[PDB]
Design a protein around this ligand. Structure first.
Ligand SMILES: NC(=O)C1=CN([C@@H]2O[C@H](COP(=O)(O)OP(=O)(O)OC[C@H]3O[C@@H](n4cnc5c(N)ncnc54)[C@H](OP(=O)(O)O)[C@@H]3O)[C@@H](O)[C@H]2O)C=CC1
Ligand SMILES: CCCCCCCCCCC[C@H](O)CC(=O)SCCNC(=O)CCNC(=O)[C@H](O)C(C)(C)COP(=O)(O)O
Ligand code: SF4
Ligand code: SF4
Ligand SMILES: [Zn+2]
Lengths: 112, 50, 386, 114, 340, 118, 198, 174, 41, 145, 6
């Protein structure tokens, strides 16, 4: 429909609503393994659920671009799978666990 | 300060009036983003495209 | 070694000093490993041993094509740490000379680009205009370049009585001079070839390698720190960022010619709307007292003596302030103890990031292509080497 | 005590790496003396390598030894690829500088602060 | 009159030796100014060559260490002002080709006398006079004999004036080593007696320089006639071939009577521009190095001589070809030493 | 897993200092006193360690002071005595710490000097 | 007085908690200082994880690395304070993540997260001596090829220990221990009187 | 507000137009016309020795030490010109002159060290050290560039008339 | 005439810090520490 | 204090006198803080310096010109925060930011008073006291400075 | 051209 996105490298993705619905539903799935009260799971699930609720709700891509911001729809696709990649990465990283170690005493005291 | 003929050769060869612009100067909880997402920039009205 | 061949430090083609150890299968470049530091001079360590006002002259030398715009970045940074802001007239001045400086940088970048390409007449055409601009610097600061005019609390001295009028005559005409270059290069049947589709950088890759400059804008990413995060009174002016598509050497060029055009729009305004007022903060604490005052009032001498001998005594803190220097985002991370002399001052140079990209830009390219790409990054080895 | 390791868990493993670097340099000395047309003797140079590799013989801590060879390996990579030139290589030999005596009487006779 | 020596020992430090050095522009000279400048000594370099040529000496001296004065040998006044404020005078005035306006006497005996003569009037603490080795007042080469004549005279103008007497010198930019190597142009390399019975002992230039400098800063040397010689002697045959060896150029030693050859020297001598060979040079070349029985020079004055083979590679490298330029001395064979 | 080392962090081998200036340089850790000229005490707060002073010969051409010691002008500032001692040990410089001496409490009262008795 | 916009101070503070909750594990201190800049301080092990979350999170996209630097507080046990300043073209904001690294305790490299860091990390090694694991090619960038010592360390003399001159005898440039003809005059500038903190 | 610098039917008229552009090099001829045009413009160069490029009063140029009309050198050795010099160029040592007044025994500006910032001009309370107009002081030897009090005082006496005029023009601004 | 006198150095901004000298004793002509000008009560 | 002055009126001037050969009293500088009159009475028993007059022409100088001759004399310099009376030998040889300060020991007398030797470019410019509670508590002799 | 007065 559009001829091309402003960003040089990005290419127009036809069936953008379908591509987003695929990525958004996947992320939601991966997040399903995160610990229940894990902060990342609750926060990202909230963001992703709102995103596809809007994607399912809006059948016009131009208004879809306005509703979840994202500039061009193609970018939103890149951001969603980038997040999908990190969600997979953090499950391995296990950031939800308690602090590695306290900073040495006086490590963060700037006046010196 | 150049004969109009020679000056003309200049304007003709150039295609615009150099006389006007001369080279000789004279006298539960909400997910929170860092800040509201930036509004995409407006197309310039005076010349959207060059 | 695939005929590894140092581009060599002495080369008219290499701005300043650049050893590009390049392995070239015949005339094709397989890998470019730029070497840097041929101009490292210690600018970051030297500053730790100097007071805030005596480190201002270092910033002009960091990237001296853009003499002042760099100062503004340190100024802003030192003003933030002190939570002082310059007076209204000084702000407009800095935007006036900030832009004049952008033109000066673009005239260098576009014309020096051509000299390496082989077009030599554009350089002489616009260096005469440059010359005329320098004279503004001199009649405002005293130095043709390396002024030291924009100081941490405003500018140093009000504009001479008459400069504005001349920064008009020039501006009124400069356009035609940009127009001419155009009739010579924008559509040359040959400029396009050597520039078009050379060093294309994707949008995602440009953000990833931290390009942050025309280089990003040329790829179509819309980011001008001057519109996104306004500094000084660049907010009160109205200009159009020249975004580009099909980012390549030719497109970005067109962008640099367009900001030369847009800066004339910003300069015009500044001349039309510069306010009556003072050009330096009134806090003798930060700005040095006027010489009539220091020669008649005791508190002013004490403030003159302490300011020149010891210093501002900035409150302890750290800040990263970035402006839109002509090359790209120029930022100073200035950590500061309560002392009058800084503790650290990493200068982010739009250029350390751009050079790094030379490798990811010039791939499968000929020797001549490498020359074109160093030009489209406006590399001034002072900022990269610092 | 209680220190996180950098490349080897113990001096033993670390020493392995030093052996490798020594070999590397040993095999390289001859080439440099030829690709840089240096006016030195391969044997002479190879002793210099030994000198340096022992100047730091005293280090007992594993972490310090690992970073030393980290530095050492970059040194030979610049030595090779002829990134360092003749002038940067010969500096190792301290050829121009006048040697200073370490004898007390010698110093007394020359410098205020020894 | 003196300058307490302060500093760590390198440039920008002080050693307290103010020294006029009249023939500094020379091959030996260059080296003498180098150490004197390195040490931090005050060096006054009299010059009559054009300023462009004297530039090479500027950089080794620290700021204000080197002062250059315009001087003419025939004009006594020029020598007078040069030594006005110096306390050490070193004389390296010498040439191989008797020039139209300067005879061997002048360059060796006449001038070097006037110089020391003034130096005394001035009150310079010590004068070092340099004359060629094996210099009999009867030696064949006019040069050597004339030089001998000088070392005597200057004594009377300046008593207790050190007289170092170096052998032909080995160093980059020297003649001894380059001359032979440059015989390449000549298809055949004549060698009197086929390069035999003229054993020669070269001495590295630096050794000579360091020695000379050490003299300036040592009370032990007064009236001493040191002889910097070398670390090994050589029959001219090995020397010639060795040279050609490092130069990697063929060698065809050819016997040619010195009688006829003195004539070849005359031929080049005839040439107006710096004759390459000199009838005297020829003779000197064949004059066999004398054995050592005089005041020890190197080592005695504090520097251990440096073998020829060690640095030969640097002196003879320029004479190699495209590939030969990459060969090194230890894969090469070092020639045998004949003490005789 | 972490490894054990009882070796005092000495990193003299990595710092890159010439041998002469690591074995012949004594640094003193001291809290700066106050120029009696001024009564402010803000420069007597942080500990500083300063390297031993070295030759300062006059320059012959201009008479400017000239120094051959690189570590002369360097004075590092450390907040506590323990941290400064640590810097000397790992860098291998010899140290001789001087205890802080702070003014003793002094009892003052305007009424006391008005005493004719004393 | 600077034109502070509290609107910012709050929004950035709120993000600072957001990040602190999202990554309880590595964030040690988060603080939106005056001047309205947010700095999340992370344990050195959190270099990879904290950056990646910021580069690839819908509610916090921090695509470009403005700078990687290392202040050196000699007093601090962990001498270096690697500071990474990141920009977000989508939320138009900037955050700084700063970690602590000692001389011989290397930090991970983020060349993976941002390739901009390929050069700055080499710059930090050359000047300060911190080492970055998994770096593609770590090697001196700014200093001379044979330079010994890391220059921006507070314990390195400004003039340095070596300087270069051309020596005729050896016909080649040659280092010599530095001998300066007018030492850097070290003016003492701190005043013995403080300023009552506002 | 943004703008697209280069963001973009086939008709014989169009094509024939485009083909002529490639075949007869029409745009290349356009470029030649521009240069021919300037060939006819007056050149902007100045005879350097005879005519000089204009420098206004604030030009920093070469250092000089001024004197009071009476003849007493202005400097009173407060030595903050030394304090604020960024390059460490100025070296000042002083002692009370027999008059009892305060004067500098030695004032040495190392011009090779100096980066002509003009802060010394700024800092001086008596304004004894000024940035003089002359920029032509190129010297054969490095030592000549180092300047002691006598050269600067002599420089001050030579250029005092213009220095006074320049300071006269710009002091209201400062 | 006055007990105390000023000394702008002559020209105000172009002179020197303004100092008031006490020409109170004919015994001594006050000398502004900046101009070395003696003032005779 | 304040960024600017409002004293558009005229200033006062006092008459420099001679307090001796060590202390230069350019007392037009005096802020009438009476620390001299105290030290000269309490730390040293000179009891000579005193206030003379009332109003804005209270000048703290000896009524008759009698030199302040006593050991412990030079301390007045160090104790007057104003530079009204300062040292006459070290009149104008230096300026404090330049002076490199090395902490050492008094050898002139056996009390071993602590002192700071202020050296510029390698020659000593002044020796002023540094505080040792037990030995010299902020004061040094006229001889050892 | 510092001063337009001869
Ligand atoms: N291997 C050797 O060369 C040996 C040399 N010696 C002796 O040591 C001395 C130094 O040798 P070297 O440096 O090779 O000699 P050079 O041929 O290099 O000449 C030495 C210097 O003397 C100057 N000079 C020559 N003639 C005159 C003249 N008529 N008036 C003024 N100056 C003059 C030259 O200056 P310019 O050219 O500018 O006129 C030159 O710089 C010589 O005197 C020589 O007798 C002894 C043994 C071996
Ligand atoms: C001519 C060519 C010039 C090339 C010179 C070269 O590049 C410079 C150079 O060698 S840089 C030397 C630094 N090399 C080290 O520092 C290794 C230290 N290795 C250890 O310390 C070991 O862990 C151990 C404790 C076992 C040592 O014990 P041992 O006595 O050797 O066995
Ligand atoms: S500031 Fe002006 S007066 Fe004070 S010293 Fe420097 S020059 Fe002399
Ligand atoms: S101490 Fe100094 S200031 Fe206070 S009164 Fe005595 S003299 Fe005047
Ligand atoms: Zn006056």
């Amino acid at each position: 429909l559009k001829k091309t996105t402003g960003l040089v490298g990005l290419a127009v993705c036809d069936t953008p609503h379908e591509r987003l619905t695929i990525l958004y539903t996947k992320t939601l799935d991966i997040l399903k393994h995160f610990p229940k009260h894990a902060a990342y799971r609750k926060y990202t699930e909230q963001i992703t659920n709102e995103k596809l609720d809007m994607v399912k709700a809006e059948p016009d891509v131009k208004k879809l671009e306005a509703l979840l911001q994202g500039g061009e729809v193609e970018e939103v696709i890149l951001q969603a799978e980038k997040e999908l990649s990190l969600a997979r990465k953090m499950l391995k990283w296990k950031p939800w666990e308690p602090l590695v170690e306290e900073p040495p005493a006086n490590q963060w005291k700037w006046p010196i | 300060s150049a004969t109009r003929v020679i000056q003309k050769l200049r304007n003709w060869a150039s295609g615009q009036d150099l006389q006007a612009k001369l080279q000789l100067r004279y006298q539960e909880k909400k997910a929170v983003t860092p800040a509201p997402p930036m509004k995409r920039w407006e197309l310039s009205k005076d010349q959207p495209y060059l | 070694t695939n005929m590894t061949l140092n581009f060599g430090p002495q080369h008219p083609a290499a701005h300043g000093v650049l050893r590009l150890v390049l392995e070239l299968s015949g005339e094709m470049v397989r890998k470019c490993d730029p070497h840097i530091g041929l101009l490292h001079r210690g600018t970051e360590k030297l500053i730790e041993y100097k007071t805030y006002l005596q480190a201002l002259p270092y910033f002009d030398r960091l990237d001296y094509v853009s003499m002042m715009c760099n100062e503004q970045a340190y100024s802003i940074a030192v003003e933030k740490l002190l939570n002082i802001q310059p007076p209204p007239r000084a702000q407009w001045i800095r935007v006036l000379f900030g832009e004049i400086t952008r033109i000066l940088n673009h005239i260098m970048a576009v014309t020096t680009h051509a000299l390496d390409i082989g077009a030599m007449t554009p350089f002489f055409w616009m260096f005469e205009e440059r010359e005329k601009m320098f004279e503004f610097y001199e009649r405002v600061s005293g130095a043709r370049m390396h002024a030291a005019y924009i100081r941490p609390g405003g500018v140093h001295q009000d504009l001479p009585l008459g400069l504005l009028d001349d920064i008009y005559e020039f501006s009124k005409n400069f356009s035609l001079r940009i127009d001419e270059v155009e009739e010579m290069l924008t559509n040359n049947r040959i400029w396009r070839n050597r520039t078009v589709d050379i060093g294309v950088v994707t949008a995602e890759d440009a953000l990833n390698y931290g390009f942050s400059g025309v280089m990003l804008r040329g790829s179509g990413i819309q980011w001008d720190l001057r519109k996104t995060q306004p500094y000084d009174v660049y907010d009160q002016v109205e200009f159009d960022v020249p975004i580009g598509s099909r980012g390549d050497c030719y497109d970005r060029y067109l962008c640099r010619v367009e900001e030369m055009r847009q800066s004339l729009r910003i300069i015009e305004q500044c001349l039309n709307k510069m306010p009556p007022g003072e050009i330096k903060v009134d806090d003798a604490k930060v700005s040095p007292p006027k010489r009539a005052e220091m020669k008649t009032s005791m508190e002013s001498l004490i403030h003159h003596f302490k300011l020149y001998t010891e210093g501002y005594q900035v409150p302890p803190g750290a800040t990263y302030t970035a402006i839109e220097a002509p090359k790209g985002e120029f930022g100073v991370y200035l950590v500061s103890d309560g002392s009058s002399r800084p503790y650290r001052c990493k200068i982010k140079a739009p250029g350390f990031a751009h050079l790094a990209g030379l490798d990811k830009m010039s791939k499968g390219h000929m020797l001549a292509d490498v020359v074109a790409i160093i030009g489209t990054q406006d590399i001034v080895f002072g900022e990269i080497d610092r | 005590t209680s220190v996180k390791p950098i490349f080897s868990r113990d001096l033993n493993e670390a020493k392995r790496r030093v052996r490798e670097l020594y070999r590397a340099w040993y095999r390289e000395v001859p080439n440099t003396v030829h690709l840089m047309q240096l006016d030195i003797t391969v044997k002479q140079g190879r002793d210099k390598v030994r000198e340096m590799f022992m100047k730091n013989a005293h280090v007992t801590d594993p972490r310090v030894v690992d970073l030393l060879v980290i530095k050492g390996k970059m040194e030979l990579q610049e030595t090779i690829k002829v990134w360092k030139q003749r002038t940067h290589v010969m500096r190792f030999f301290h050829e121009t500088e006048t040697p200073r005596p370490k004898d007390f009487l010698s110093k007394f006779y020359m410098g205020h602060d020894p | 009159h003196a300058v307490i020596p302060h500093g760590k020992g390198g440039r920008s430090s002080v050693s307290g030796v103010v020294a006029t050095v009249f023939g500094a522009t020379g091959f030996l000279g260059r080296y003498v100014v180098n150490h004197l400048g390195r040490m931090g000594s005050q060096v006054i370099i009299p010059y009559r060559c054009d300023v462009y040529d004297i530039m090479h000496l500027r950089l080794m001296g620290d700021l204000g260490q080197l002062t250059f004065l315009e001087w003419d040998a025939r004009d006594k006044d020029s020598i007078r002002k040069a030594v006005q404020h110096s306390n050490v005078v070193i004389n390296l005035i010498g040439r191989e080709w008797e020039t139209r306006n300067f005879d061997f006497e002048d360059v060796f005996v006449n001038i070097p006398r006037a110089i020391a003569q003034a130096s005394k009037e001035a009150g310079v603490e010590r004068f070092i006079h340099v004359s060629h080795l094996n210099a009999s007042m009867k030696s064949s080469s006019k040069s050597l004999r004339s030089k001998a004549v000088g070392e005597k005279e200057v004594r009377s103008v300046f008593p207790e004036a050190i007289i170092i007497r170096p052998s032909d010198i080995f160093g980059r930019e020297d003649r001894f080593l380059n001359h032979f190597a440059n015989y390449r142009w000549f298809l055949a390399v004549p060698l009197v007696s086929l390069g035999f019975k003229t054993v020669k002992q070269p001495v590295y230039v630096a050794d000579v320089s360091k020695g000379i400098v050490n003299a300036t800063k040592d009370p032990d040397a007064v009236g001493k006639t040191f002889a910097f010689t070398g670390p090994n002697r050589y029959l001219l045959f090995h020397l010639v071939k060795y040279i050609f060896g490092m130069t990697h150029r063929t060698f065809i030693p050819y016997p040619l009577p010195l009688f006829v050859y003195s004539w070849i020297g005359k031929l080049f001598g005839l040439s107006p521009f710096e004759p390459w060979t000199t009838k005297d040079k020829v003779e000197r070349i064949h004059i066999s190095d004398v054995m050592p029985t005089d005041l020890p020079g190197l080592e005695d004055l504090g520097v251990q001589p440096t073998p020829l083979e060690l640095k030969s590679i640097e002196v003879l490298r320029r004479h190699r070809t495209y590939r030969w330029l990459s060969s090194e001395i230890e894969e090469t064979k070092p020639a045998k030493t004949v003490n005789y | 897993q972490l490894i054990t080392v009882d070796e005092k962090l000495d990193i003299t081998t990595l710092t890159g200092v010439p041998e002469e200036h690591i074995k012949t340089r004594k640094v003193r850790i001291f809290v700066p006193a106050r120029n009696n000229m001024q009564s402010g005490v803000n420069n007597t707060k942080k500990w500083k360690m300063e390297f031993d002073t070295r030759e300062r010969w006059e320059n012959p051409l201009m008479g400017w002071a000239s120094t051959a010691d690189p570590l002369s002008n360097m004075v590092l500032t450390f907040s506590a005595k323990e941290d400064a001692i640590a810097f000397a040990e790992k860098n291998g410089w010899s140290y001789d710490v001087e205890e802080k001496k702070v003014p003793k409490p002094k009892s003052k009262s305007y009424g006391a000097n008005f005493s004719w008795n004393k | 007085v600077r034109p502070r916009s509290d609107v910012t101070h709050k929004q950035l503070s709120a993000f600072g908690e957001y990040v602190a909750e999202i990554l309880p594990k590595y964030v040690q201190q988060v603080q939106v200082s005056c001047l309205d800049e947010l700095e999340i301080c992370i344990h050195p092990d959190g270099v990879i994880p904290t950056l990646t979350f910021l580069r690839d999170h819908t509610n916090a996209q921090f695509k470009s690395l403005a700078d990687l630097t290392a202040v050196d507080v000699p007093t601090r046990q962990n001498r270096f304070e690697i500071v990474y300043n990141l920009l977000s073209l989508r939320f138009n904001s900037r955050i700084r993540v700063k970690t602590y690294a000692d001389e011989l305790t290397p930090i991970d490299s983020i060349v993976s997260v941002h390739i901009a860091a390929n050069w700055y990390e080499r710059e930090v090694w050359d000047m300060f001596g911190v080492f970055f694991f998994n770096h593609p090619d770590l090697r001196r960038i700014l200093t001379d090829y044979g330079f010994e010592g890391h220059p921006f360390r507070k314990d390195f003399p400004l003039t340095g220990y070596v300087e270069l001159r051309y020596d005729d005898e050896v016909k080649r440039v040659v280092a010599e221990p530095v001998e300066l003809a007018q030492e850097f005059r070290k003016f003492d500038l701190n005043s013995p009187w403080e300023a009552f903190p506002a | 507000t943004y703008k697209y610098v280069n963001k973009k039917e086939v008709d014989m008229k169009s094509a024939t137009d485009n083909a002529a552009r490639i075949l007869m090099w029409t745009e290349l001829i356009r470029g030649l016309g521009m240069t021919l045009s300037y060939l006819f413009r007056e050149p902007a160069t100045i005879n350097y020795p005879f005519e000089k490029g204009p420098l206004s009063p604030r030009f920093r140029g070469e250092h000089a030490l001024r004197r009071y009309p009476s003849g007493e050198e202005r400097c009173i050795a407060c030595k903050l010109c030394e304090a604020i010099c960024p390059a460490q160029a100025i070296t000042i040592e002083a002692e009370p002159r027999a008059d009892g007044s305060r004067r500098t025994t030695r004032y040495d500006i190392d011009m090779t060290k100096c980066i002509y910032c003009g802060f010394c001009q700024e800092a001086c309370p008596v304004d004894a050290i000024v940035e003089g107009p002359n920029f032509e002081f190129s010297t054969e030897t490095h030592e000549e560039l180092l300047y002691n009090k006598e050269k600067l005082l002599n420089n001050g006496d030579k250029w005092e008339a213009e220095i006074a005029a320049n300071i006269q023009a710009d002091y209201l601004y400062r | 005439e006055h007990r105390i006198i000023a000394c702008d150095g002559g020209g105000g901004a172009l002179g020197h810090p303004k100092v008031y000298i006490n020409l109170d004793k004919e015994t001594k002509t006050g000398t502004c520490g900046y101009c070395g000008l003696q003032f005779k009560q | 204090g304040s960024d600017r002055s409002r004293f558009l009126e005229g200033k006062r001037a006092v008459e420099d006198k001679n307090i001796g050969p060590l202390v230069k009293t350019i007392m037009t500088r005096c802020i009438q803080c009476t620390r001299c009159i105290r030290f000269a009475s309490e730390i040293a028993g000179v009891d000579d310096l005193g206030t003379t007059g009332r109003g804005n022409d209270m000048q703290v100088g000896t009524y008759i010109e009698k030199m302040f001759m006593s050991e412990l004399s030079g301390n007045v310099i160090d104790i007057c925060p104003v530079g009204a009376l300062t040292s006459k030998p070290y009149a104008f040889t230096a300026r404090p930011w330049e002076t490199r300060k090395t902490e050492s020991i008094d050898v002139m007398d056996a009390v071993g008073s602590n002192i700071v030797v202020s050296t510029r470019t390698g020659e000593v410019m002044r020796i002023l006291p540094r505080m040792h509670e037990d030995i010299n508590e902020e004061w040094i002799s006229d001889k050892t400075r | 051209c510092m001063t337009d007065d001869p």
